Structures are given as C-alpha cells and as structure tokens.
Design a protein around this ligand. Structure first.
Ligand SMILES: Nc1ncnc2c1ncn2[C@@H]1O[C@H](COP(=O)(O)OP(=O)(O)O)[C@@H](O)[C@H]1O
Ligand SMILES: [Mg+2]
Lengths: 48, 888, 67, 67
C-alpha cells in the first residue's frame, strides 16, 4: 500500500520538480541579466 | 537461505544452532553445527532460526517470527556487546552487567530529551522522558516500575531515573555539566538515596547491596510542567535479621560504617568498641567488596549535613544506634533455685541506661523481674533467661523502628516546605525483589508475595484491559486467553471471603493464648489440605514445615515463632522509663506508647491496608514497566546462565505480551481529537457542515488509503496499530515548519530590536556615567576638596523640616497598624471566649457521658454474671428433670 | 502574583479538605442504604419467626387439648 | 484589588456551599447511626423470636412423644 502511494507520489513530484527546476532556471537568467545591468551601471559610474 | 537451519535445545546454552537432515512421523533428525553431533528431536521441540538481518535487532515487536531461542540469542549477543537495553513494544527489558560503563552523560541526556523512540537507540532516559511528555500533554498522573529478583539490578535503573527527573523537571531560576547547581529540592532528593541505602541495605547471598525495604518516590508538577514538590514513601522492612545473622551475611551498612569510621573522641562519647565485642554480632565482622567503610562513614554524615541536619541530631542517632548495639552485651545467667534471671555483667546495663539517661536500678529490675499491670492489679512477673533475652531483643527492635521512622519523617519534612498545590505527579516504584535462602520465615514471605501479586496486576493491565476496551467500543476483534493467572495462590494467603487464608489463620491462632505455631500449621494443613497451590509438610511435621506454589517455583516455609511477629510484645516498665528519658531525642522517639503489648493489630491486616492503598494508586496512574534480568547468581560480569534468563523471561510473560501488542491495536484516539489533530491532511475533502466526526475520519483515512487491517473504528475511540499517528504527526508538523521558520525569524527580529533598544539606553547611561567618573577621578587629588568636605556639613541642607515631616508620615502609618492590630486582637478575643465556652460545655458533657458509660458497663457486667448464674442453675435443673424422668 | 499564589493555595486546601468530607458523605450514604436493606431483611426475618412461633403455639395448644 | 474581591467571593461561596455539604454529612451520619441502632434492636428481636420458636418446637416434640 505504502509503495503504491509512493509510486503515485513520485509521478506527481517529478512533474512538479521539473516546474521548480524551470523556475530556478528563469530566476538564474534573471539574476544574470541583473548582474549585467549593474555591471553596466558600475562601468557608467567609473566613467563618470 | 537454508530453511533446514533450526534452534535445538542445549544443556549449556539453552538453545543453539543446528541443521535438519530428514524427518520421520512427528520427529526430525538434526546435526548440531558446533560439533556435527547427530540427534533426533520432536517437531515441537525445535524453533525457527533468526535470519542474519534480524541479528541483535532492537524492538521484539519487529521480529519476522516470534521465537524464544531467537530472543535468547539476540539477548546473549547484546550482553556480549554491552548494550544492556532492548525494547518490547510498550516497555523495555534490561540485564545486570555487574560493571560500570560510560552509557550516561549530560551530552546523552540533552541528546535524548524531547526526541521520539523511532529516531534513537534504547535507553532508560527515553522511558523517563516519554512518561514526562505524556504526563505533561495528557495532564494525568504517571509512574515508572522496575521489576526483577534480588540481584537483577533495579537500584541502578532507579538511580538513573530520579537523576534524569532531577534535571529535566527542574524550573529555571534565570541564573554546562554534571556539577551543575540544581534546585534545593532536587539537591535533597539526590542525597535521600544514599541516606536511605546506608540505613536500609545489607549484604545477602543474592546481592551485596540488597535493599531490606520497599519504597515509592513521587515528584509533583505545576501547570507549566516543572517540579514543585516531592514525597518519599517507605514500607515495612526485614528488621529481624539485624541481630540474628546467617553465615557471611551482614547487618545494616551504617553499623559497620560507624564501628570502623568513628574517631577516638566519638568512640568515647558513644561508649563504643571495635568489631567482635558484641553478643548481637554473629559471624563477627563480615567483609564487603568495593566499599571503603571509613570513607562511607564520612560521606553519609556529610549527606545528612547537605540534608540540613544539625550536629546534635546526627550524634543523637549515633547514641541510639550505639545503644541497640551495646545492649546485646547485657548477658544473663539463671538462678537454678528460682528459675529467675540474674545479671552478673551489670556494667553493660549501666552503660546502656547511661546512654539512655534513665535509672540503672529500675532498668536492671524491669528486665530481670518486672512488675506489670494486669487489669486492676500490678503484679510481679516471673521471668526466665529466655524471656529476658526476648525482652531486650524486642527492645532493640522497638528502638530501631522508632529511629528509622524518625529518619523517614525527617527526610520528608525537608521536602514538606513546599505548598499543597499541584497539577499532576510522576511516581517511581522500587520494591525489594524475589528472595530466598536457607530459612524462609514470615519476614521474607510478604515481600515474595507482593512481587508475584505485582505480576498478577500486570496480567490484568496488559492482557485483560485490552479485551475489555475492544469489547466496550464494539470493534471487530476475537478473544484469546493464554492462561497467565496467580489468583488461587493469592486466595490461599488472603481472606476477602472464606475459607480463611494463611494470614487469617496466622492471626486467629495468634490471638488464642492456648494455641501455638504448631496449632497454626496444623489448622493450615487441615483447612487448606488439597488446595491446588498448597502443599503439606515434607514428612518433617515436628519442624512444622509447609509449602506454597509460586511462578518463581514452589517454596517451603518454616513457621517457628511467627506468632511473636504478629503480636509484637514489648516490656511496659522499660517503655515507661524510656518515654521519660533524660535525652529529649529519646523522649521524642518514645513519646507514643499506645502499641504497648504485655500479653493488638495484626501485621497481615496492617500490610494489607498499605498494599490496597498503593495498588489503588497503581490502578489510577499510568505505569511504565522496565524489567531487569539476572545473568548469574555468582554476581559476575559477562557470564550468563541461559536457563536463568530463559525462565525469567518466560514467567514475565513477554513472549505472550509482544504477540498481543503486534496482533492488536496499541494506539487509540477519540474521533474528534483525530480530526482536530490531522484535518489539514484532508481539509478539502472533509465537509464544513456539522456531523458525526467519524465520517470525516473515514474520509481522511480513505484519502490516506490506509489498509483496513491497520485500524478499527469504534463509536468513540478509533484504534490504530503501532506508531502510525506519531509519523502522521511528524509529517503534519513538517508541513508547518516552513511558515514556522518565517514567523520565528520575525519574533527573533522583534526580540533583537528590543534588546538593541535597551542596549542604546544602557549605552547613553554609561556615557554620562563615564563623563562623571572621569571628571571626578581627574580632580579628586586637589587639596581644596578636604576643606570643602569640612565646611559643607556646617552650612548646607536644613534637614529638620524634612525629618519632622517623615516622622509625622511614619507616625500615621504606625497608628494605622496599631488600629489594625487592636481590631485583630478584638476579633481573636471574641473567638477565644467562644471557643473557651464551647470547650467548657464539651468537657462537662464528656464527663457526663463517661459516667453514664461506666454506670452502663458495670451493670452490663453484673447482668452477664446473673445470666451465667441462671444458666448454670438451669443446667442443674435439666440434669434433675432427666434424673426424675429416668426414675418415673 | 503572590496574592494569587496565597489565595489559590488557601482555596485548594479548603476545597480538598471538604471534598474529603464529601467522600465521607458518600460513604455514610452507602452505609445508610446498606443498613436500610439490613433493617428490611431483619423485619422479614421477624415476620417469619413470629409467624412460626404463633403457629408452634397453636399446634401446642391443639395437641394439649387432644391429649 | 479586583483580584482580591473575586478570589475572596469565590472562596466564600465555595466554603458555604461545601459547609452545606458538611451539614448533609452530619445528617447522613445521624441517619446511619439511627439505622445501625435499628439493626441491633431487630437482631435482638430475631434472637429472642428464634429462641422462643426453637423452645416451642422442643416442647411440641416432647408433648408429641408423651402422647
Ligand atoms: N545498568 C548498570 N550499569 C552498571 N552496572 C550495573 C547496572 N545494572 C546493574 N549493575 C551491576 O549490578 C550490581 C547489582 O545490581 P543491583 O542494582 O544491586 O540489583 P538489585 O537492585 O535487583 O539487587 C551493581 O552493583 C552493579 O555492579
Ligand atoms: Mg537493590
């Protein structure tokens, strides 16, 4: 019974883990874009 | 795996591993794996092997197949490993190692406290903590119960439990290691054990530290769950042995500790000598391993000092204990011309009466030829050598009982500073174990009886209570009885109804002055004859021997002088003298004399009274058992007798108990509680509208998709199999932990902000302090300050108006207090005169009723005499009428 | 808080002392009912014994008259 | 002051309520003792009645044997 409940749970959890992984990839790319933006800002401040 | 492998019985090891070759009818041919020896057993004899994965496995409830031999082997391997603890479902079993191990520390205590059994290895700390947590959560009373034979180790478990309690239950004063400064009551509690042990324990063939007494501790808690008080109850002790010592056995440890440890100054004060100088000390000095008598003497006295004893109330105990030791030296010799006792060694009596502060002349004659009041007359008692011996030994018993009573009351009164309020309590029961030797008198029987009666109580609570609960809730279950029952043996001894048991017969034949111990045993044999648990004399009828059946084996008893134990006879003249002793301490010990007996209450009935009370407490509280097992009778570490542990395990009924634990449903909860505790798991499925909560519970149980064999639904309680609720609770809490951490960060943030804000006020205060102190410190070496200091008190501050105003203000307060004191005085005066008049009226009325009673009772006696007279005359008339009728 | 502790201790002690008196009331009532049953039983015994006595006297007088 | 008033009121009310229970204990004990005396009296009646019955039977048998 426990194994069957787990089997059902693993299927759901793998799909949700893919969603979470995708969310982290999006936030990673957002943080990378932020890093580029603030790097540009730092260069502008240095030139100023 | 090789399915032909089996446990086969062994004369040396109880059971041992072997391999089946073939089978024939009801039998199997097998080869022992240790030597290759062939043998044939019955198919009922051999048992199935414990697989490798289950070797040394923890809880007995987890075993793939319940086998006595597998349990035995797991126990032996664990004893060789030194892991003494093993779980058995709801309870725990242990085994005496006879050797100290580092299984106990503050680090371990902190590691165990508040954790669940499933996440931890076994320990007594876990049992103590579980009882504490359940006590706190349910707000009911709880108890811990250690059980086993005389050598089995209980006192080590008890020592660990009260130590654990004395740290976990402590309230924090707001002020880390084992030298931590505990609270005052915990400090007393941790000293009470060594105090009581010194006065109450002795060496026996079974145990070098054998407790001669039964005890019960309890600790009381507030609504917050912290300790606020404690009590120490103690039951009747094996006091007889102390001056009638069997070979290689010892008296109470305090005697040896005093005789060895006393300074020359102390020795002269107490009029003491070294060993072998005392008639009451058979075998002379008897040694004991591991102890250091002088050092023990120091530490027990220091323990009494920590318990807040004065030096006088220590030395007074030493005086009385010296007195019982010395009085044995009052040797008697009988005058053949008169059969009366005489005392050639009157020096001993002079020493004793000096230590007691009474008259030597009266002390001598009240022992040798006393004058005793018998009703109306006061008459010279003829007194033999044996009667004089009996009198002084009985006096020693009386002195000892009074001193032990004083000790027990004094130690409780230390705790009795605390208030009468409390929420609930946790108990600790520690009764002396099963015990036997070359003589079996009444003094051992009561202890052995309570040991087996406790096992019978366990039978009820473990087996019967379950069937009753399941039947009450009406669930799908089937009754079973494995036949664990001691009741006929209890009924043989006790008298709740007829026919009369051992105790009742002993009391009845004790009361009758014409009867003796032979009369008692004869009546027992006649009236109990062929009772399933009784057995007659082993041909030695002249020895007045008889026997009774117990689960620990049949025991033969010796009835000699049981009547004096029930009657408790004591000398009235010496009692009167001691009651009026010159020593205030002795006068206090002997203040009560209403149990004087020159021939009241039966010791059996007294014992029953305390027993029913404690047993009712055991029925009301929730007990936690911790069973301890004897490895061998030679008091040796590492060595283990398979047959001893086997038969102890069997009679404890653990193989039967664990079966019903796994087969039944140990967890149980009311439906409303089940829903309110776990609803989060099915909140979308459970309807909001009001209904029978069991429907919501069914919906939740279905959502969890539980197997219907794992639970049973009653009308009120839902029963569940082991631990499921505690794992669901863990999962539910884990679901909440994420938001809890976020809230915790906010609360800790608030706390940090508060602390920082306070620190700012402290910083600004400190800055102005520093300005002031630096300014003064720089300048105070200037000379002018001395002149300023001379001049200022002549000029500044008028003072006297402020002083006058202050005096006037305080005068008003003092006048107010006076008015209140006078009002209270008047109230007390009004109540005083009322109580005085009521006292007067009651005294007058009492005197009237006493006179009326006297008048009634004297005439009652007169009428009884006339009744007897008329009855005798009527007998004479009946004789006469017969003589007439025969003549006619 | 000290006033609370004192008054609560007083309340607790006074309550438990009189609760023991209430237990004594329960015991007294039980004993009363037991003795009431004993009185009824003994009254039935007196009824039967007196009837038997009177019947014995009747038979005695009858036989005495027949002799 | 309000805590004092409340706790004192509670103490007073609970004390008088349980004092009424103590009076009920006194009444119950009085009734118990009364019924105990009645039991002893009735036991004495049974003693006398039974003795009289047995004596009547003895005399009956004696006279029956004499006839
Ligand atoms: N848990 C334990 N750890 C260490 N030694 C133990 C332990 N339990 C028992 N012992 C040993 O067993 C001896 C006797 O056990 P004891 O507690 O006196 O048993 P009982 O109270 O049943 O007579 C002790 O002196 C000690 O050496
Ligand atoms: Mg012990």
């Amino acid at each position: 019974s426990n194994l069957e409940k787990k089997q059902k749970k693993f299927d759901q959890m793998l799909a949700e883990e893919k969603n979470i992984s995708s969310k982290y990839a999006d936030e990673r790319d957002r943080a990378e874009a932020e890093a580029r933006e603030k790097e540009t800002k730092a260069l502008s401040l240095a030139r100023a | 795996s090789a399915k032909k492998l089996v446990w086969v019985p062994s004369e040396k090891h109880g059971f041992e591993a072997a391999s089946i070759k073939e089978e024939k009818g009801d039998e199997v041919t097998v080869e022992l794996q240790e030597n290759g020896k062939k043998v044939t057993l019955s198919k009922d004899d051999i048992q199935k092997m414990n697989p490798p994965k289950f070797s040394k496995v923890e809880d007995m409830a987890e075993l793939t197949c319940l086998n006595e031999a597998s349990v035995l082997h797991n126990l032996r391997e664990r004893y060789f490993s030194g892991l003494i603890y093993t779980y058995s479902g709801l309870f725990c079993v242990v085994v005496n190692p006879y050797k100290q191990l580092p299984i106990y520390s503050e680090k371990i205590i902190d590691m165990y406290k508040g954790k669940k059994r499933h996440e931890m290895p076994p320990h007594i700390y876990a049992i103590a903590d579980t009882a504490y947590r359940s006590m706190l959560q349910d707000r009911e009373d709880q108890s811990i119960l250690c059980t086993g034979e005389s050598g089995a180790g209980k006192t080590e478990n008890t020592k660990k439990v009260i130590q654990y309690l004395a740290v976990v239950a402590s309230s924090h004063k707001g002020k880390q290691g084992p030298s931590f400064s505990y609270g005052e009551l915990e400090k007393q509690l941790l000293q009470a054990n060594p105090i009581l042990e010194a006065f109450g324990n002795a060496k026996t063939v079974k145990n070098d530290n054998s407790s001669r007494f039964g005890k019960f501790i309890r600790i009381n808690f507030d609504v917050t769950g912290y300790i606020v008080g404690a009590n120490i109850e103690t039951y009747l002790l094996e006091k007889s042995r102390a001056i009638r010592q069997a070979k290689d056995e010892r008296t109470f440890h305090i005697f040896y500790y005093l005789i060895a440890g006393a300074s020359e100054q102390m020795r002269n004060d107490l009029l003491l000598e070294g060993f072998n100088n005392y008639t009451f000390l058979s075998n002379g000095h008897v040694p004991i391993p591991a102890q250091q008598d002088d050092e023990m003497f120091q530490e027990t006295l220091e323990a009494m000092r920590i318990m807040g004893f004065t030096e006088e109330e220590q030395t007074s105990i030493l005086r009385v204990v010296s007195s019982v030791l010395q009085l044995g030296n009052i040797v008697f010799k009988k005058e053949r011309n008169t059969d009366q006792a005489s005392m050639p060694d009157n020096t001993a009596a002079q020493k004793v009466c000096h230590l007691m502060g009474i008259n030597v002349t009266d002390f001598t004659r009240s022992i040798l030829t006393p004058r005793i009041k018998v009703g109306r007359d006061v008459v010279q008692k003829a007194q033999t050598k044996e009667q004089a011996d009996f009198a002084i030994e009985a006096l020693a018993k009386a002195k000892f009982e009074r001193l032990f009573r004083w000790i027990l009351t004094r130690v409780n009164k230390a705790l009795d500073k605390t208030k009468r309020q409390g929420a609930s309590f946790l108990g600790i029961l520690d009764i002396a174990g099963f015990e036997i030797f070359e003589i079996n008198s009444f003094e051992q029987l009561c202890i052995n009886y309570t040991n087996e009666k406790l096992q019978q109580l366990f039978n009820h609570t473990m087996f019967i209570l379950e069937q009753e609960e399941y039947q009450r809730e009406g669930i799908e279950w089937n009754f079973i009885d494995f036949g664990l029952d001691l009741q006929p043996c209890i009924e043989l001894i006790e008298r709740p109804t007829n026919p009369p048991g051992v105790l009742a017969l002993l009391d009845e034949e004790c009361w009758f002055p014409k009867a003796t111990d032979t009369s008692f045993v004869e009546k027992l044999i006649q009236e109990q004859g062929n009772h399933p648990k009784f057995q007659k004399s082993k041909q030695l009828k002249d020895k007045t021997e008889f026997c009774i059946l117990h689960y620990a084996g049949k025991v033969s008893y010796n009835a000699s002088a049981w009547l004096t134990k029930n009657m408790d006879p004591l000398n009235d003249n010496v009692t009167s003298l001691l009651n009026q002793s010159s020593d205030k301490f002795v006068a206090d010990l002997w203040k009560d004399v209403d149990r004087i007996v020159g021939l009241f209450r039966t010791v059996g009935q007294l014992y029953k009274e305390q027993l029913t009370k404690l047993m009712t407490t055991l029925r009301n509280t929730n007990p936690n058992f911790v069973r301890c097992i004897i490895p061998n009778h030679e008091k040796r570490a590492g060595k283990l007798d398979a047959h001893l542990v086997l038969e102890q395990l069997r009679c404890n009924g653990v193989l039967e108990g664990i079966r019903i634990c796994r087969q039944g449903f140990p967890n149980r909860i009311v439906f409303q509680e089940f829903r309110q505790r776990y609803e989060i798991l099915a909140a979308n499925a459970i309807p909001k509208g009001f209904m029978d909560g069991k429907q919501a519970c069914i919906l939740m149980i279905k959502a969890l998709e539980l197997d219907p064999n794992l639970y049973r639904i009653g009308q009120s309680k839902i029963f569940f199999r082991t631990g499921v609720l505690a794992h669901l609770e863990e999962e539910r809490d884990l679901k909440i932990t994420d938001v809890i951490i976020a809230f915790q960060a906010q609360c800790r943030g608030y706390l940090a902000r508060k602390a920082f804000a306070k620190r700012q006020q402290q910083l600004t205060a400190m800055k102005v302090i520093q300005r002031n102190c630096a300014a003064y410190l720089k300048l105070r070496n200037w000379q002018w300050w001395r002149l300023f200091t001379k001049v200022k008190p002549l000029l500044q501050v008028t003072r006297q108006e402020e002083e006058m105003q202050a005096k006037d203000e305080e005068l008003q307060r003092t006048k107010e207090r006076q008015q209140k004191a006078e009002a209270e005085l008047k109230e007390l005066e009004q109540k005083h005169t009322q109580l005085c008049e009521e006292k007067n009226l009651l005294q007058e009325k009492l005197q009237a009723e006493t006179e009326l009673y006297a008048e009634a009772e004297e005439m009652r006696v007169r009428l009884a005499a006339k009744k007897q007279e008329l009855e005798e005359i009527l007998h004479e008339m009946e004789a006469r009428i017969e003589e007439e009728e025969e003549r006619s | 808080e000290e006033k609370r502790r004192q008054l609560l201790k007083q309340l607790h002690e006074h309550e438990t002392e009189l609760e023991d008196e209430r237990k004594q009331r329960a015991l007294a009532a039980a004993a009363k009912k037991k003795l009431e049953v004993d009185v009824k039983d003994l009254e039935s015994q007196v009824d039967s014994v007196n009837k038997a006595r009177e019947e014995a006297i009747k038979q005695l007088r009858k036989l005495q008259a027949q002799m």
